[PDB]
A paper describes a structure:
As the virus buds from the cell, the viral protease cleaves [name] into several fragments, including the capsid protein (CA) that then assembles into the mature capsid shell (core), rendering the virus particle infectious. The CA portion of all retroviral [name] proteins folds into two separate domains, the N-terminal domain (CANTD) and C-terminal domain (CACTD). In mature lattices, CANTD interactions form only intra-hexamer and intra-pentamer interfaces, while CACTD interactions are also involved in formation of inter-hexamer and inter-pentamer interfaces. Our results show that, like lentiviruses, [name] is sensitive to [name] in vitro and in cells, where in the mature CA lattice [name] binds in a pore formed in the center of the CANTD hexamer.
Residue numbers in the entry:
A (entry chain B), B (entry chain C), C (entry chain A), D (entry chain D), E (entry chain E): 11 to 148, 152 to 229
The structure:
Amino acid sequence: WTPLEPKLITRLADTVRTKGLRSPITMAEVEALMSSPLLPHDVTNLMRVILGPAPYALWMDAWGVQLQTVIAAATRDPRHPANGQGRGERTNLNRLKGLADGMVGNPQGQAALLRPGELVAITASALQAFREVARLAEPWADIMQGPSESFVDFANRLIKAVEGSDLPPSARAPVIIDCFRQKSQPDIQQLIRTAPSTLTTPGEIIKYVLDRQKTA
Amino acid sequence: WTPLEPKLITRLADTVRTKGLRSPITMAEVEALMSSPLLPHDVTNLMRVILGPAPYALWMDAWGVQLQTVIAAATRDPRHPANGQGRGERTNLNRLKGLADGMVGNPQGQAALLRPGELVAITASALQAFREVARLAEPWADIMQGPSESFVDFANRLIKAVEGSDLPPSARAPVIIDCFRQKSQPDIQQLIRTAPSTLTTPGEIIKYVLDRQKTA
Amino acid sequence: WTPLEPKLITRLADTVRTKGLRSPITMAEVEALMSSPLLPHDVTNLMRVILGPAPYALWMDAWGVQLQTVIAAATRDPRHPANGQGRGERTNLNRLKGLADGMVGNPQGQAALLRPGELVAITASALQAFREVARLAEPWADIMQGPSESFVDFANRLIKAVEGSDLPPSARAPVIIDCFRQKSQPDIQQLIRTAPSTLTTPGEIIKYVLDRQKTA
Amino acid sequence: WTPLEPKLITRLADTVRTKGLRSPITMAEVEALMSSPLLPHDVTNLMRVILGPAPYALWMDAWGVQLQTVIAAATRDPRHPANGQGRGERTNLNRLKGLADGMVGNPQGQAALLRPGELVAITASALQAFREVARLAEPWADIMQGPSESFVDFANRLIKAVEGSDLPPSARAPVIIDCFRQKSQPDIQQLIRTAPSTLTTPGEIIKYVLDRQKTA
Amino acid sequence: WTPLEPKLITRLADTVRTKGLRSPITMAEVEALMSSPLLPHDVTNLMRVILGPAPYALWMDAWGVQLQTVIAAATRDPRHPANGQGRGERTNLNRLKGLADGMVGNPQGQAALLRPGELVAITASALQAFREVARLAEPWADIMQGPSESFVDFANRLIKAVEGSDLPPSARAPVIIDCFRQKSQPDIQQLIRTAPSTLTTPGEIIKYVLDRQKTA
C-alpha cells in the first residue's frame, strides 16, 4: 500500500473549499485522484479530509447505500469481478467497507486480502456517492435578468441553474430557450422576438444577442 | 490515449477565470495546452472545464461551423491529410466530432480509428473556434483621458480597445495616433501639438509625452 | 542526517497559519511530515518553526510529559525497542530529549548514537504532544441556528463543536441528533418532528431536512 | 528550436504585473529568462506577453534603436561575431529583427540561418531596450518624512527615488545624506545634528538613528 | 560557478516581504539558501534582491564589520582555513569582499581564486550580519492584555516581545512569568494567584490558565 500525497490532498481540499462540491473542475479533480483503485482506507480518509463533517456524514450514508446496491447485484450474479465461482468467495459488506476480519484499521492487510474487482467496485461506488452528496448539499423558474446585469452573466446563471436541476436531460434546451425569451428584460425580449432567422439552440440565441446587443 | 493533467487544466481554468478569455497570456496558455494533437474527447472535456456554460455553447457552435468549413475544403480536395485516396476514406463530420461508430464516449477507440491529419485539423478548428468565441463574449471612439488619470493608463486602455475591435490591421496605428491627438486632455493635446519633430508612430508619441510630461 | 526541506516546512507553517492547529488537513500534513523517524533536533526545530511561542512552550511541556510516560513504561519492560537487554542500554531522558553527551546541538552525533526504536518512540511522543496542545489551544450546548443561517452551516458548526469536545465517542451521535431536534429554529424543528420515518443518524436527518426544506 | 515554458512566462508576467517593470526582482527574473540566446521570435513573443500594449510599443522602438546602434558598430568593425570576413556575411537589420527572407513568422528557419553571435547581440539589445523602457514608463527633492511615518519607510522611499533618478552614480550618497539631514522631521534632524561621531554614509546614519530613536 | 535559482530567490523575497526579516521561518529559509558556500557575488546579489535599499545599506555595513573581525582573528592566527602557512597566502579584505584583482564583477574568476575556507568564512559573516540587521530594523514592559483580547494572543505577543529584546537569555522566563502575573487583566490575575500548585514555567502557567479560563 502506498498513500496518496498530502500535497495533492491539500490542493484538492482547497479546491473543494473555494470552488465548492459541484463545480466541473472539482469533479474533474476528484476523478483525477480517483484514477487508481483505492482501498476503503484511502477513500475514507480522503473524504474525511476534503469534506466537512455534515457532507461527510451524508457521504457515508450514500456510500453505504450504493455498496448495498452493488452487493444486491453481486448476489444476483455469481460472475461479479468481486465474487468468485464458489460460495466461499462471496463478498460481504464487511469486506467492502473494510470492516471484515484482518482489515479494521490496517491498510496493509486491507490491500492484502482485497480483490482488484473489489477495489474498482468500491471506487465506483464512492464516486457515485460523492456525486449524490454534491448534488444534495448546496430555482430556475425564478431567475430574472437584473436591470443592470449583462446578458452573458444572466445566461451563465440560467444555464447553471437549469442544468443543475431535476429536469430530464431532453428538456433543458427548450426550457433554456423559453426562459431566454420570457426573462431577459424587454429590450432583449424584443431583440429575440424580431429575429429574421429562427433560433433553435441556446448557443445561437446567445450569439445573436451578443452581436446585436445595445452597447452600453 | 493519455489524458491531460488535471493540475495543468486547473491552472488554465484559473487563468481563464482571472485574466479572461481574450488576454494574450490566456491565448498563449491555450496554445501551450493545444500543442500535441488532441482527440475530440480531450478538447471537448477541456472546453467543458475551462469555459462557463454559455461560452461553452457558443464554442460548440463555432467549432461545428469551422469543422463544416474544413469538411467542405476536404470534399473540394481529395488530398486532405484527413482524407484518403479512395472514396472509402472520406471523413464525415461524425468522425471529426467523435460521433462516428466505435467512438461515442470511448477515447481509446477514438485514438484507434482517428488519423493524425484528422487530429491536427480538429485541433486547429477548435483553436479558431476558441478565438472566435473569445472575441465575441466580452468602444474606442468613446475613450477619453480622465482628469486624474495618468497617460500610460490611458494609452493602455486606448490601444487595447483599438486592437481588440473590428478595424482592419492597417488602420490601427493612424487611429491610435489621431485619438492620442484629440483625446488626452488639452495639456497633453498642446504638448503633442507643439512637437518640434513629427511623430509618426504611437510608440514615439508615448515616449515624447513621457519625457516632457508635467510631473504632478 | 538529512534535513527536512524548508519548502515543505514553509508550506506546513502557512497551513498551520491559515487552517489552525486542529483542522484534519493540518493533522494529516503533520502526519505526512512525521513519516520518517525524526531526530530530536528535527522535531524540535520543526515545532519551533511551525508553532508560535506560547504553543511551543505548551508543546515542550506536553512532549516532556509523554516522554516521561514512555520512560516509565521502559523501566516497566526491559524489552523496549529503545532499551537493550543489559542494564547498560537503559535509555535516559537526556538521550530521548537530545540532552545526553555527544548530542547537545549536534544532529550528526545525534543520528549516530540514537536507536531506531528511540527515534520512533520520540516521534510518536511528539505526535501525541502535538495532538494534546492542538486540543488545548483554541461550547456545543450554546449553539443555535441563526434566523438567517442555512442548515448545512448550522450542522457543520454543531458537528464540529460536538466532536471537538470532551464527550465520550459513544455519546456524540445521540447528542448531535437531540441538538438537531431542539435547536434548529422551529420550522426545521417541526420538519424533523413530523417525519413519517424514524431518523436514527445525523446523516439521515441532514438528508431528510435537505430534501424537504423550504427553498428560500 | 525549443519554446520557452508558458508556465515560466505566466509566472514572469504575474511578477511584472504585481512588482512592476523596475523592481530588482523583476530585472533578475528577466535576466533569468534571458539566459540562453533567444531568437527574435522568442524575445518578440515574450515582450508581447509580459508587457502591456503601450510598453510594448515603447520596447519595439527602443529595441530598434539599440539594434541600429549595433549595426553601426558592426559596419564600423568587420570582426563582429555576427558578421563574417567577406562582405557577403554582413548582417542587415532584416536579419536581426527576423524580417529577412526565410525567417518571417518561421522560428525553425530563423534558428537555422541565424548565427550565435547574432543571437547574443539581439539578446543584449533586447535587454538594454527593456531597461530603457522600464526606466521610462513609471521626485527625490520633494520627499518629506510624514508626521506619523517611521524612519525606515522614509529611508526606503528616499533611497528608492534617489537611485531611480537621473543623478550620476557618484552623487547619490551625498544627496541621500543631505536629504536625511534636512528632511526627516526636526526630532530626527536634531538627533542627527547632535551626533558625537561624524556620519559619512547613509547606512551609518540609518544605524545611528535606529539605535537612538525615540521609541513611540 | 552556478547561480542560485531565481525561482527560489523570488520565493525568498516574497517570504521576506510578507513575514518580515525576523520571523523564525524567514531565518530558516535564509539558512536554507545559505547551505552551500556562496561567493561574494552570490551573497551580494541575494541581499540586493531580497532586502530593501535601507536594510541593504545596513547589511553592507554589518557585513564589512564582521569581515573585519574575521580578518583580525586571521592575523591573530596563521592557521585560518582562509589563510595559508606562508605570508603570501594572507587574505586581504579585498579578497573577501570580492574587490581583489581578477574578481571585480566576474563570478567565474571569483570562484577560481577563492578558497573553500574563504567561502565558508564569508558565508558565516554574511549570516551574522543578516541577523544583526534583522534585529536592528523593525517594548515588553508596556504590554497589557486588552479587555477583549484572548489569553493565547496576549501570551504570543508578550513572549515575542520578551524574546526579541535586549534581555539576557537567563532572564526571559522569570520576566515572562512576572508579566503574566501583573499584566493579564485582574480576572486572570486572580486565576493565577489562587493556583493550588506552584507554577514555575510560562508553559505551565499557560496550560493552567487555558484549563480554568472563563469560557466567554
